[PDB]
Symmetry: C2
Subunit: 306 residues, 2 copies
């Protein structure tokens, strides 16, 4: 029992983190086999930040302008190329700690672990979710760029996020590992703002199912709803629309608890109307939306506490 | 900027986790140098768990009754002994991945990272605090026993917790790595109740400082208080007493923010007496008490390991 924001163990990713320096700029890179991936803005200077021409900046660099340090060892850069917003530095050594891995581009609402790093060294690990407005609510300081987000279902690391920037509201933006940004953002310091964010409805429903699995039913009610009526109400509270795909994904939790998905939707409607009246759910006084259905199944018992 | 419940990187500990099996019971062990540490109740069966005599159970076991597996490799057990509630299995090979480490016993209110493991394989990491009632609010299923809690400083892993059991309210109890329980618990298959818990005041103040560092300031006010008056309020809301040592420990955050501890105490007093009036702090509608002052400093300054 219990329910925590649980990250994946970070060791398989720690062994891939390196420091990349170009000029006076230092950030983190990800060393997989004989390639180091890092944000391309490592090649910018101070006069470059608003409208950098990355193709023009990069042609002026040789391999030896990039200093890559793995722990105490310098790696030798033997080639470089840019793919979208990431730089790929070919190095002369394959990383002996490379885990089994893949690159995946995730959808809003998906969660992942972040290993926050500075100067190629890990500082901590935490869970994040891709918000509907394609930002993440991270914890990142100067020098954290190139830190990555990942999942490790089974034995394989799926890298899904590379950190590039902080927006004015204090939230964060970055790319997949092919260098395409999530959302409409660009790696320029021109004025950019995140869109209005919404709550991830399917994740709130998953977390209510987690609460039932762990033994709490106080928030259920005798009512049901149609999917259409639920979405009409949910939108009034800035909740994302719930689709038939989301209803299907909740199937296993519904089966384990005996609570039909649209009955849990009626419970959520009432919670939005009433608040918690001084109670908590899984230790929270707010409705939590950064656990996915898959996260709940990963963490919770397969036996409900009836 | 931003502020998240952050665990330590777990790689140094992952390399130490093994699977220990005795009879039909399987749980996790911690392999350091040439010793594997695990809960002594691995030697119990069903008819033993209600009132175990561990000294008598251990005599019937030979070294080959303990099956220790590190990944795909079996370790050969060459000795066994018990220290309080921890079994120590001497093995024939030192763990080549042993980090610099020590065993430490923590105080209530201190936080640590848990590496939750099953069948010797790490499955997740999260941050926990030792509650004033010596439980932790963990997330553990059958087979999680022997999972460990730890802190890191520089290069040294300080192991502080080994998981043994779940209490009826769904919170968790365990030992230090010398086998001494935290709290008034025993390793027997009986319902044992956690005492009434209280809120860790110095940690709530640390988190209010984190909120200020991150720009969330609505709860600051013109008032200040004394330690004595604040502690009357703390007692009334089931908060731990705030000592002068706590005031000193908040010194670095009070310096980084420029806000005196007793000024912040006047803010917390008002939050306890009036609530949040529908607002949140760092995204929470509750007063969070599982960040220590050092946790706030470590996260807000980017400290690496």
């Amino acid at each position: 029992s219990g329910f925590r924001k649980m990250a994946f163990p970070s060791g398989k990713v720690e062994g891939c983190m390196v420091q990349v320096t170009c000029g006076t700029t230092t950030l983190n890179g990800l060393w997989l086999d004989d390639v180091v991936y890092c944000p391309r803005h490592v090649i910018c200077t101070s006069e470059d930040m608003l409208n950098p021409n990355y193709e023009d900046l990069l042609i002026r660099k040789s391999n030896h302008n990039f200093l890559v340090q793995a722990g105490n060892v310098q790696l030798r850069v033997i080639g470089h190329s840019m793919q979208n917003c990431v730089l790929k530095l070919k190095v002369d050594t394959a990383n002996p700690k490379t885990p089994k891995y893949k690159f995946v581009r995730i959808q809003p609402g998906q969660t992942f672990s972040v290993l926050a790093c500075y100067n190629g060294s890990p500082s901590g690990v935490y869970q994040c979710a891709m918000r509907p407005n394609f930002t993440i609510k991270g914890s990142f300081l100067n020098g954290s760029c190139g830190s990555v987000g990942f999942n490790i279902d089974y034995d394989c690391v799926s890298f899904c996020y590379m950190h590039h920037m902080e927006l004015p509201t204090g939230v964060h933006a970055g790319t997949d590992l092919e260098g395409n940004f999530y959302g409409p953002f660009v790696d320029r310091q021109t004025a950019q703002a995140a869109g209005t964010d919404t709550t991830i409805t399917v994740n709130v429903l998953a977390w209510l199912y987690a609460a039932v699995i762990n033994g709490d039913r106080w928030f259920l009610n005798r009512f049901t709803t149609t999917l259409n009526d639920f979405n009409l109400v949910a939108m009034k509270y800035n909740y994302e629309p719930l689709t038939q795909d989301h209803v299907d994904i909740l199937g296993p939790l519904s089966a384990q608890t005996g609570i039909a998905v649209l009955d849990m939707c009626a419970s959520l409607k009432e919670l939005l109307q009433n608040g918690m009246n001084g109670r908590t759910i899984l230790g929270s006084a707010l409705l939590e939306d950064e656990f996915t259905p898959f996260d709940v199944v990963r963490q919770c018992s397969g036996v409900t506490f009836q």
